[PDB]
Symmetry: D2
Subunit: 460 residues, 4 copies
């Protein structure tokens, strides 16, 4: 600590930033006014890149309009690359995820870290002497209100992409299972009550179809993010950011990201409570209620062994109950229900954040950021988890399943056309009286013959 | 009274009542709220439309006797015509079993209405039987979800309109105050200036994009069903029936009905609902936001950031004028609160799926409609008695941009 | 439509009010001002009897204080005494449950009502000529800033009193069922995976006891409400209500309601709502959270006849298909499931309100109020419907239940001392590879005579 | 790194655990089995230490009754104390915070770590050198059902304590500003309109009146955590841990922790879901609310200079504005709002989980756990954050705050008992007409004297 540093000045005096540290003062200061969590701007989905990309785009746009020097500019776009590549300058954003000011402190860190990389690429000493001053260069023709969210938009939108991959990955794990159990008679349960014969295979594609729609909805609600904002202005009208610049900027932005992003709804209201995040997250919450229930079924479908819907079998990952062999805890789905619940609850946050909008700026965006990011993150692993650890090892107990179908009283329906509806009923009450089955009542009443009898019952 | 037959014995239902035994029994079993299906945002009208659509189908498919099939759609038209024989839906909004009680009720009300329009005595007289004929090739698992999706689709058309009107109020002021300077504020700190007029246009635009979202999502309801599934696949509707029946449901509701993705999960929880309630929540977030500012902008006289004089609706400190309590933008927060809270209810509900069916459709129902109602009303209550009567305060609005501490931003050169 | 009306006037000019109508000027205006939904101040859980009591109480302390005339004080309360009872003259409180103005709307509604009702009894013609001024004589030494929350608190409390009673009738029902089924054996099961043998009498005792701690949690948080504020806040310590009054009023308010009312510790908050609300509604949400569990169980235990768990039979009361008795819907628990999610959903509606605090007053108290009452009310009924239409007549299925234990793979945990743990560890394993019961594998191998086996197992 | 190992065995198989790893196959297994977040059981509020504190009390009772041999018992509790000697052997708990098994994975994690420190001290090798056994000894007359819950509360009871210290360290800064802002007048707003005069001093004290109540609730609410269930049930009563061990070990826990650990007022369903949780996190939800409210007021009462409120001024933290100065962003009050929002969000997560209870056991405790902790952590650091880089050096622009109180026509009120209501009205009218203050109006409109007028306005 204290050892080998660099003294850097600003509006608020001179402080000695940690030498080698690519983050400058503004950042250094953030690292002290914000101490809530241990989670700092460190990514798995994106954001840091989301920022450096928003810069490159802004950079290569500035050089075009010659708003800034081509000498400094190509250093800035290049600088980006030293962070995009293998992020040969990554995790230089030590600011707590929790931070105030709608994210000035984040655009400020991105600027700084990038400012030095360029400078050092230009062979200069970073820090004290900035021949590539971040402000009038790295962040020229922009402001947090526009540069901050567009970074968050690229990010989330790219995080979502990763989420769908995972979702798809988990779907084949449902499909392979369907193709596996395609012909094992299970009887459904509406309101828990039995219903009408079905195959477990059909139970399992239902899941993959269920997530297929989650994907449909996700990638759809995610396009609200594409309408990025770069080159707007704090309040009304616009500073000189507005010009043929703004569009040229994102035109480069889309040239980097590779996302069909376009100039936002327009240049008014914008940042003021923009809840396209209420929607994109609102999507992540849907996956929650869904995946959860998907995990809710498995846990109960694989309920009590030797005493419960013993239809399937989740992989024993924990320790056997040797002397009390009665167990195989539905562990993997449970943890997923947890993430779901968490996911679900993160909604309630972001909403409050959006509701939090006050006048010409809604600062609570960063809370929407880590909240948003959190869900995409956990869901993904919650998906790979169930996938790799759970669904791939489930296997039905054909016997008790098929036997669920042949012991119901609903199967008398399939006899009705042959023994007359009225006997079917008398066959069904008896079955619901003697404790027997439609296969025995029929056989003790002398209604059919086994050959005949056992020439039907196998679904449709 | 008249005495109808039902498996759980013969219950007797008051003769003038067009519903039937199930409906009757379902009024005793479920007794939570005071509110039965008190549909303001269409619902029942949606339910009847579904039966009327199933009838047209059933006929043009030879499922039931042409006369009965016609007796049906006929009864359906007496209900829709001007929302007539309505009232026969006395089931609590809080009920059970896929809202079976709502499907059955509609079946039976249409029965006695279709009956009389044949000279048959009401109720029990079953030449035109409800289940066999009105509910033919239909089940709770499928009719019910659909009347809900369509009902909701229409309340949302009415919603956006209402919203579009509020929009009007803003883009009215927007052009009104337009000529009025004002000092913008980000983080409540003083940013660069803008015209008080521009402030309101953003409110419109906000709502402009709100609409763009509410419809955008509402169209997902169009993926419906009629004659679908209890389990995986689903019983024998899968003939001309369903698509033909949705084709029917289309031309009737006027809405572009479409047969859903595939027969496997639908009534078994629908993310479409969470999503549409979602759409309704975001609108509640921004509308709430818009009103907050409206209260912040019309704060304490002289000593309290005053830029727009909001309407006055109650008392004035006699001894000395000193208030104009933002009573209306306030009530808009209150609603948005009730709407957002419902997004939890719809969440719990739309997550409690039991294997092959969600039994909580009704609660998502009472939550959806309820939230659509107050919101729809909200937009108006703000419109008529609030924004339509908002007057600026120029000298003050401009005053802030003139005594602007950092005026030099442009005065650099 | 406009069939004969009396003329009244507020600071905002004149208006015409239905003569009959006791809800004067303000309220008439108020009715129009907000067109959110039908439900007006139609509080069955007693919001009016609250406001009326707050006024009856406060008035008495103004007579004892001698602020207003005895004769008009006697009428504020003489009138109050009326409105109360089964809930007499109290009908003229007609403003939409969603209403800005922080409750002035309602505070005035009551102010007026009691004046006119009091004037009718004063022989006076009521109306315009107010001999009990809704403000200068009723609304004396007060303000919404304290009257509204007081009534609210005072109201919610009594409403909660009803809730617990209801909840206990449900507790009594689960009880008698714990007494009935007590001798039925069932295999308890953690994480859905089988755990160990217990009586289906105990599971119901878990229910009553759950609720038992749930009621205690309700009436716990409840009494917090009793800490009120009558005539004071609008900024801090309060306006010129001091001396006897404020503490004396809350005191007399205790002589009315029948509640151990205490003035708040300080008096610099409340205006900006109180966490008591989130707290009490917390108990309501918790209650809802627990009732859900019970019903999800109730449903789970009745799950599918002959193809579900099939332990308890929820009494049938709806449908009926003869040919296929492979059914019987858990409809009543389902409904309670539904009243929960809503009450749970109201925890946000209240929350978001409490948070909406601005400077020295939270202007969203009424959306907390209604949400409050909705929760506290629907829940209560949610109890009786379950009790009366479901649990009060559940039957179990012994042979099935008991057959879940007698056949569970690990019941040899008590034969081990007799067959030697080592031997047991292989029986309970020979069972899994066969499906056979413990007895069978035991009996086949012959490690224990049917007698020295049938003469041991229950507990 | 993966540089060395040792092979342990369980019911499933043999997986070689690290030579430095005091955990066994289980933790290693439970490390792989679940992998959702990048937050394993780091544990900054307490958890681990509370967990070792339970395993320790357990032994202090097993030693006694002798369910295990005095020696090993001492090796166990010796293992405990090494962990607790300042929070030494803490890093040995790598399983995630998101985890199924309902705590089987945390339960064993502890069981092993203490098992290893135990025999190791005894002079035995780390690894399956079981002369102490996690299960057979450390977890004697214990199970996930009672160890994980009871412990979890403990680790949270102690944590919330560190919170009341935060919220109090905060209360101190607040009233610090109260005692300072004494003679600082202003206008208390209700519904954002200028209501009545006061001193900004009380304002900050109001904030504290606010926080102190939170603390009280939290003090009350934490109490619930004390009802522990160590050495209890299995399904619907009690396996064989029940005897004297049951309320003895609780006495031992009470001792080894100091907290008045009392046993369940009964014994069942508590493990199947205790509502004390929904009530505690709810108290934290309330805290985040009223606090966040205050934060929001701070951002308001300081708003934009000469174009916003500007009553009090906040500390400059961010490198200011260069070209066009006119800002002092509430960068911190901002963050406090953000955390508050998460707490509130962590409340629905706790509810949903609290709803996810199934029959004889709730398995969503872990998430209620990771949700409880996240909240107690950021709330504590918020109070200190707020208190340290903001509300410790706030200022007041006395003149404008007095500009406001002396501004609004409201002030007429007190000159009213002197000049007469009638004269008090013209004054109110004139100012309304003109745009002058009650001073100049009562001035030119000859009524009072300079002295008289300045002889009263400070309150
Ligand atoms: O990372 C970009 C993409 O690369 C492709 O090769 C993979 O198939 C995708 O899973 C991945 O999302
Ligand atoms: O009188 C018996 C009780 O039965 C319940 O069903 C009613 O709802 C209560 O109001 C009544 O007190």
């Amino acid at each position: 600590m204290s050892n080998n540093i660099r003294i850097e000045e600003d509006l608020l005096g001179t402080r000695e930033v940690p030498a080698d540290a690519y983050y400058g003062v503004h950042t250094l200061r953030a690292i002290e006014n914000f101490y809530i969590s241990n989670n700092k701007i460190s990514d798995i989905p994106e954001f840091v890149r989301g920022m450096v990309m928003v810069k490159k785009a802004a950079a290569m746009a500035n050089k075009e309009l010659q708003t800034i020097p081509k000498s400094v500019a190509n250093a800035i776009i290049a600088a980006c690359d030293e962070v995009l590549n293998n992020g040969k300058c990554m995790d230089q954003f030590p600011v707590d995820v929790y931070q105030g000011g709608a994210g000035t402190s984040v655009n400020m860190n991105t600027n700084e870290v990038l400012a030095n990389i360029g400078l050092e690429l230009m062979g200069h000493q970073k820090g004290e002497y900035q021949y590539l001053n971040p402000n009038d260069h790295v962040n020229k023709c922009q402001s947090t209100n526009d540069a901050y969210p567009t970074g968050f938009r690229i990010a989330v939108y790219s995080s979502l992409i990763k989420l769908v991959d995972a979702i798809n990955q988990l779907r084949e794990g449902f499909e392979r299972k369907a193709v596996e159990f395609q012909d094992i008679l299970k009887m459904g349960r509406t309101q828990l009550q039995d219903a009408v014969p079905m195959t477990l295979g059909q139970e399992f594609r239902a899941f993959s179809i269920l997530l297929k729609e989650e994907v449909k909805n996700i990638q759809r609600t995610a396009e609200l993010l594409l309408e990025v904002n770069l080159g707007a202005t704090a309040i009304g009208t616009g500073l000189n950011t507005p010009k043929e610049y703004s569009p040229l900027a994102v035109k480069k932005l889309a040239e980097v990201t590779g996302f069909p992003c376009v100039p936002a709804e327009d240049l008014i209201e914008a940042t003021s409570d923009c809840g396209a995040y209420v929607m994109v997250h609102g999507a992540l919450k849907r996956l929650a209620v869904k995946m959860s229930k998907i995990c809710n079924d498995l846990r109960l479908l694989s309920s009590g062994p030797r005493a419960g819907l013993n239809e399937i079998n989740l992989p024993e990952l924990q320790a056997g109950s040797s002397i009390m062999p009665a167990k195989v805890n539905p562990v993997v789905p449970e943890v997923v229900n947890q993430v779901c619940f968490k996911v679900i609850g993160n909604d309630t946050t972001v909403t409050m954040a959006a509701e939090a909008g006050q006048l010409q700026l809604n600062v609570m965006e960063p809370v929407i950021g880590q909240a948003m990011f959190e869900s995409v993150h956990i869901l993904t692993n919650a998906c790979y988890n169930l996938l790799e650890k759970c669904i791939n090892g489930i296997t039905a107990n054909k016997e008790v399943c098929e036997g669920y179908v042949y012991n119901s009283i609903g199967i008398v329906t399939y006899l009705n056309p042959f023994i007359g509806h009225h006997n079917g009923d008398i066959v069904g009450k008896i079955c619901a009286e003697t404790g027997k089955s439609v296969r025995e009542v029929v056989l003790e009443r002398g209604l059919l013959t086994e050959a005949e009898l056992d020439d039907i019952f196998s679904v449709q």
